[PDB]
């Protein structure tokens, strides 16, 4: 089992479309009813859903937000009735310090909800977090929740889908501070999926609805095998151990109109495609640390071995000199059309990601020398006296970059 903590407008939407994808996959009706064709289903549902006496299924989700508008719109959707009104929380009434201050203020009810959800699962495995690191809501609230959660639950995993601000595009003027602080908290508490609007929209090209549909696709494909038990990799901890910051790529990212080219898609061509920097959805002979490829559809392990052999000989990849990939196979949901003969998802750890922080650090250093937009921060208690928090966070990020 698992819980999802989605914050800010970004996280709220991310959750909306993630649950849309899930209910599509598992044959769950918008109202929580189960379709007749899926009555005898074999798919495991406990992982993301828990059924109710009324036979309906409820997501293990909690909605958090500093503002009402987004969730109010969500509850006007056809999927509104599905969620649990008890879990959803809205502030009665764009800065990280303010977000953390509110988090300190509203500890009690949030952790009440989290405890209630936790006690309903026998074998909870970890946590899932969806949020954006730039905006005031996501950054600060996620920081506070991560801190108090790692404190509260020292034996549960914490996984996040953190969305990083666009850089080529000059959105949050105060983004460097929030990003740097959120990164501090991620290193200091997060167990383990980086995301950026820049490269994501780049691949989308070459509304937020479609972008986050792709993101939800990534999340669902990541959790597929856990959802669909097989032989190997039957747990999230198995995933994490086989890799341990990450980046992702998915081959069949094709529009509903781009099915006309039914290209004979082997496993070799897919696994190859997952390697190119173009497909890496995120934007010094930098090299890899780990690679995992989850493959959906018919697959012959002989083909997998041949592809691995050929790629190894062709040396299209580079590895650490000081240490000695993985190809897991799953089964598609029996419901969604198998427009793709075989499909592939890749999650990897690669040193080049360091550059991200070097940019943000460069951004942050490009402001701290002139004290820009610190007036609001001084208002909050945390930065009321000084900003030693900022210095510690910057040095922690520098240490991480040095370690990479």
């Amino acid at each position: 089992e698992i819980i999802t903590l989605q914050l800010g407008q970004c996280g709220n939407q991310i959750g909306f479309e993630f649950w849309k994808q899930l209910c599509a996959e598992h044959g769950i009706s918008p109202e929580g009813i189960v379709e007749e064709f899926a009555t005898e289903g074999t798919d495991r549902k406990d992982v993301f859903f828990y059924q109710a006496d009324d036979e309906h299924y409820i997501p293990r989700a909690v909605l958090l937000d500093l503002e009402p508008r987004v969730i109010h719109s969500i509850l006007n959707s056809p999927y509104a009735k599905l969620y649990n009104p008890e879990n959803i929380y809205l502030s009665e009434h764009n800065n990280w310090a303010s977000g953390f201050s509110q988090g300190e203020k509203i500890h009690e009810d949030i952790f009440d909800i989290i405890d209630r959800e936790a006690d309903g699962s026998d074998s909870l495995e970890g946590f899932v977090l969806c949020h954006s690191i730039a905006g005031g809501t996501g950054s600060g609230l996620g920081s506070y929740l991560l801190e108090r959660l790692n404190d509260r639950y020292p034996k549960k995993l914490v996984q996040t889908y953190s969305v990083f601000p666009n850089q080529d595009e000059m959105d949050v003027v105060v983004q460097p501070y929030n990003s740097l602080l959120t990164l501090k908290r991620l290193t200091q508490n997060a167990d383990c999926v980086v995301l950026d609007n820049t490269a994501l929209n780049r691949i989308a090209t070459d509304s937020f609805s479609q972008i986050n549909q792709l993101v939800s696709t990534i999340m669902s494909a990541s959790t597929t095998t856990l959802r669909y038990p097989g032989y190997m990799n039957n747990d999230l901890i198995g995933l994490i151990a086989s890799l341990i910051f990450l980046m992702t790529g998915y081959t069949p990212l094709t529009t509903d109109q781009s099915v006309a080219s039914v290209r004979k898609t082997t496993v070799l061509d897919v696994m190859r495609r997952l390697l190119q920097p173009k497909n890496v959805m995120v934007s010094t002979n930098h090299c890899y640390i780990a690679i995992l490829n989850i493959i959906q559809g018919e697959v012959d392990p002989t083909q997998v071995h041949k592809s691995l052999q050929r790629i190894r000989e062709r040396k299209l990849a580079n590895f650490i000199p000081w240490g000695p990939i993985q190809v897991a196979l799953s089964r598609k949901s029996p419901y969604l059309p198998s427009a793709h003969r075989v499909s592939g998802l890749m999650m990897a750890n690669h040193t080049s990601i360091s550059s991200l922080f070097e940019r943000t650090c460069r951004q942050y250093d490009k402001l701290r020398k002139r004290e820009a937009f610190l007036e609001q921060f001084r208002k909050e208690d945390m930065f009321k006296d000084n900003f030693d928090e900022m210095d510690t966070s910057r040095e922690i990020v520098q240490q991480l970059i040095d370690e990479y």
């Binding site: 038990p229 097989g230 190997m232 039957n234 901890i237 151990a241 086989s242 052999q309 240490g323």
Partner: protein, 288 residues
């Protein structure tokens, strides 16, 4: 006037087995339980037993009941087939090793007992190996989880330590990926498209004879003897959950030597078995 009647009896004898007594179901059901094909069951049975570790864990009050608690967490089963899983033992252990002897025997009734032989006991031979494998991916998962709570504490002694786990885990996650390809998928492709009365005895005696690709045969036994040296050192690595870092640094160096010795003993055994051919392609990939 004789051969015209022999073919009609046999064809009616074999057909009587499938469409009435579900012979095709029993095979695709024992694999769900014995060969641990169905997840959330082995990952729930082995996970329970390993939580304890003598006089305990041996009486029929815990091990004869842990199964009835395991099947509930299977999400697949709880059928008339799902019963008859006698989780019995065959030895009384006295007291760091990689051995925990324990059997798991299926049970059948009369019109099926005549085909599934009471010797085809060999599942129990291949089972105790597969369970022993789970002992790694849990104990190794423990140290991966035991170290998580240690996280501020960032220094050369820490990062250089965790790279050992990633270097030792990958060797287990590849030898398991091999087993999950030979004994469960390709050997099951045969004997499933092979079937479709005497032949049923031999075809089954050829399906399981799973023990050849499983490195349990005495012919390739030296390949199996080296595996214990690997599995043992990972268990010692779990004992030392940086007061004794150097004591662990020597352990890992012994691990890198034995693994480097395996790649040579398997290569020398290629000249003398196409099954082992896929192993070298698994253990070696962009290295020597």
């Amino acid at each position: 006037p004789l051969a015209a009647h022999i073919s009609l009896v046999n064809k009616a004898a074999v057909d009587y087995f499938f469409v009435e007594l579900h012979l095709e179901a029993h095979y695709e059901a024992l694999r769900h339980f014995l060969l641990m094909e169905d997840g959330e069951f082995a990952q729930s049975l082995s996970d329970l037993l390993f939580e304890k570790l003598p006089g305990e864990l041996l009486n029929p009050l815990v091990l004869n009941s842990v199964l009835s608690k395991a099947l509930q967490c299977s999400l697949h089963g709880d059928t008339p087939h799902a019963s008859n899983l006698s989780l019995a033992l065959k030895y009384l252990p006295e007291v760091p090793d990689v051995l925990s002897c324990l059997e798991l025997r299926y049970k059948v009734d009369w019109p099926l007992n005549i085909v599934i032989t009471e010797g085809c006991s060999k599942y129990s031979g291949v089972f105790s190996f597969l369970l022993q494998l789970k002992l790694m991916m849990w104990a190794l998962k423990d140290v991966c989880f035991h170290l998580k709570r240690t996280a501020m504490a960032g220094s050369v002694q820490f990062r250089q330590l965790q790279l050992f786990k990633h270097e030792m885990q990958h060797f287990v996650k590849v030898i398991q990926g091999y087993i999950a390809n030979q004994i469960l998928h390709v050997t099951w492709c045969e004997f499933r498209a092979r079937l479709a009365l005497e032949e049923i005895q031999r075809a089954h005696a050829e399906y399981l004879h799973a023990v050849f690709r499983g490195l349990l045969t005495e012919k390739a036994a030296p390949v199996m003897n080296v595996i214990h040296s690997i599995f043992s050192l990972v268990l010692k690595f779990r004992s030392q959950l940086h007061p004794n870092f150097a004591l662990m640094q020597q352990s890992y160096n012994t691990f890198k030597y034995y693994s480097h010795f395996l790649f040579k003993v398997v290569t020398k055994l290629v000249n003398r078995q196409p099954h082992l051919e896929d192993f070298l392609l698994r253990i070696n990939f962009n290295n020597y």
